[PDB]
Amino acid sequence: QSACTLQSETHPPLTWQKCSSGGTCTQQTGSVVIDANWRWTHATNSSTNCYDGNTWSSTLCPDNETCAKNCCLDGAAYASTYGVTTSGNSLSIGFVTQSAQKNVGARLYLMASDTTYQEFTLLGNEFSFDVDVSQLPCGLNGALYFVSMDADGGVSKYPTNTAGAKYGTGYCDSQCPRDLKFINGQANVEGWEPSSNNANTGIGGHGSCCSEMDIWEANSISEALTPHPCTTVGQEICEGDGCGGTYSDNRYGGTCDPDGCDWNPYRLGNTSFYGPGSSFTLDTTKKLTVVTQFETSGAINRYYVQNGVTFQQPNAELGSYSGNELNDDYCTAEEAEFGGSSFSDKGGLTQFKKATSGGMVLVMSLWDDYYANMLWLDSTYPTNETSSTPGAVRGSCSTSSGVPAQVESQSPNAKVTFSNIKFGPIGSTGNPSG
Ligand SMILES: CC(C)NC[C@H](O)COc1cccc2ccccc12
Ligand SMILES: *[C@@H]1O[C@H](CO)[C@@H](O)[C@H](O)[C@H]1NC(C)=O
Ligand SMILES: *[C@@H]1O[C@H](CO)[C@@H](O)[C@H](O)[C@H]1NC(C)=O
Ligand SMILES: [Co+2]
Ligand SMILES: [Co+2]
């Protein structure tokens, strides 16, 4: 797709800290851009929609190539339309924003310039951030993660995409998303099936796959750390059901691992670590600092800080595994006790190491789940299982919670605030900010 200018595009500024092994940190100035799927896609010479509701214009978009030629992505009114605001090192994302139309959530990427994404090499480094999840109830996910996207949004590889990173193109994750309206400079109108429960989305004949590092997927009730490997490290298109993921009828038939090796303290047995109020180790009604370290072995370490008190990831005992480090032994023990073969089939942490050794783009989002009501994160999943089934209970939310239309109606003012992002060598982000 191309870019249009009927609505101006001004990326909300966001500062972060780059720290060094020497003990000091320096401020970096970047910005955030909303993903192409949330934007208004219209004709290049008029204001006629190429996509409206969950359907494509059959005349402007008869096939994927002609659609990309006749259509363009326009600018976003971040605050008034999408409920996205920034202030210094802080980013706030509202749940439901009412303007001329209703908008639900947003998916944002950190930029290096107004036309390029910021790339981070996670291996050997650590990522720290502050988060306020107090206004996030059951069914919502305030996510901070990394994906192996191209810095230009895919422009150099696919010239029919001239919109690029400036307009949030080139997204991919481990679910190999088929809901994307534009993949590889072409539309996704061919094979498009409108969502039966979402008036704004659908599923197309193409999907976009790549490695995904879920540093943070959470709400006020539950939180999870999940690395997801793929046989092909970076962005790659997939065909129909051969994609795998949430959008396909078989989630394990593709090139990526849609499950991942998840570490959820509640799911592993510590139901007293994370929750609302002083009855938990980490009080989710207050701001908390989350630090994630990627040592060169490929293992992931984690610690938290709240009110000056430091807590390492809680120890978990699963099978022959014992400890608090997310390593190969944890992931193998998880598959043995909770079930599944997806993580190991795709290569485990050894394959995932190829992703963290390369560049990855920072993604910050807020969304509800139209496929599984976020039950996989904060409730009992599958719903017919009990606590007697290993790893079934992931949180205290009811198996009846998270219905999109209901949470959108009941908690429209829900929000997540990500702040004070610090990045640098392991053991360096706890030093003074510059
Ligand atoms: C932030 C988001 C892109 N991360 C999603 C992770 O890939 C995990 O995905 C998922 C894992 C298990 C079930 C699911 C159901 C619906 C949607 C996603 C699911
Ligand atoms: C949960 O983890 C915290 C922090 O490590 C610890 O203090 C607490 O004792 C743990 N509780 C249980 C029941 O494991
Ligand atoms: C839950 O339902 C699934 C699908 O019917 C089934 O495979 C599984 O055995 C059920 N579990 C229980 C505890 O009934
Ligand atoms: Co094709
Ligand atoms: Co280690």
Side-chain angles (χ1 to χ4, degrees), residues 225-432:
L225 171 55
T226 316
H228 292 256
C230 301
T231 55
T232 294
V233 185
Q235 196 277 318
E236 189 176 66
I237 191 171
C238 58
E239 287 293 320
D241 268 44
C243 284
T246 313
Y247 304 104
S248 301
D249 295 326
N250 176 35
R251 61 188 292 110
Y252 305 122
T255 56
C256 286
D257 159 38
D259 297 343
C261 172
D262 67 297
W263 190 299
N264 181 326
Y266 194 108
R267 196 188 185 197
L268 296 174
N270 197 317
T271 65
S272 299
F273 184 65
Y274 185 87
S278 59
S279 78
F280 298 81
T281 304
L282 291 182
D283 189 350
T284 62
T285 67
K286 294 162 186 153
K287 192 171 76 177
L288 62 156
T289 302
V290 185
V291 188
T292 313
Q293 315 174 311
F294 302 76
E295 56 178 54
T296 55
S297 74
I300 306 175
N301 279 293
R302 156 75 61 78
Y303 72 85
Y304 313 78
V305 186
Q306 191 172 59
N307 301 309
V309 187
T310 303
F311 308 99
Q312 197 72 30
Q313 182 81 112
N315 289 317
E317 288 191 62
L318 196 58
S320 64
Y321 171 80
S322 185
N324 57 65
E325 178 180 73
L326 196 173
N327 49 45
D328 278 321
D329 286 346
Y330 167 68
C331 299
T332 301
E334 210 211 338
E335 292 200 321
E337 295 293 297
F338 295 176
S341 68
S342 187
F343 187 73
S344 53
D345 281 0
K346 268 68 194 179
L349 288 181
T350 294
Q351 184 58 28
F352 194 70
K353 188 178 166 173
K354 296 180 187 171
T356 55
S357 294
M360 288 182 93
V361 175
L362 175 61
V363 187
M364 282 173 285
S365 68
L366 182 56
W367 56 292
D368 49 3
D369 178 17
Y370 278 76
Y371 176 73
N373 298 173
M374 219 63 78
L375 298 178
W376 51 274
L377 177 66
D378 57 33
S379 186
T380 301
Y381 195 69
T383 59
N384 66 304
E385 303 296 313
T386 59
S387 59
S388 68
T389 304
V393 183
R394 303 102 189 288
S396 62
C397 297
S398 173
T399 49
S400 73
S401 71
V403 174
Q406 175 160 32
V407 293
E408 278 165 41
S409 172
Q410 289 178 183
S411 312
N413 299 304
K415 57 176 183 172
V416 62
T417 300
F418 292 115
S419 60
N420 197 41
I421 295 171
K422 304 182 80 180
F423 176 78
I426 288 176
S428 75
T429 65
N431 290 319

Side-chain angles (χ1 to χ4, degrees), residues 143 145 171 173-175 212 214 217 228 246 251 258 367 369 371-372 376:
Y145 58 114
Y171 185 67
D173 68 38
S174 61
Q175 299 303 307
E212 186 188 351
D214 294 306
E217 281 190 288
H228 292 256
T246 313
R251 61 188 292 110
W367 56 292
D369 178 17
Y371 176 73
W376 51 274

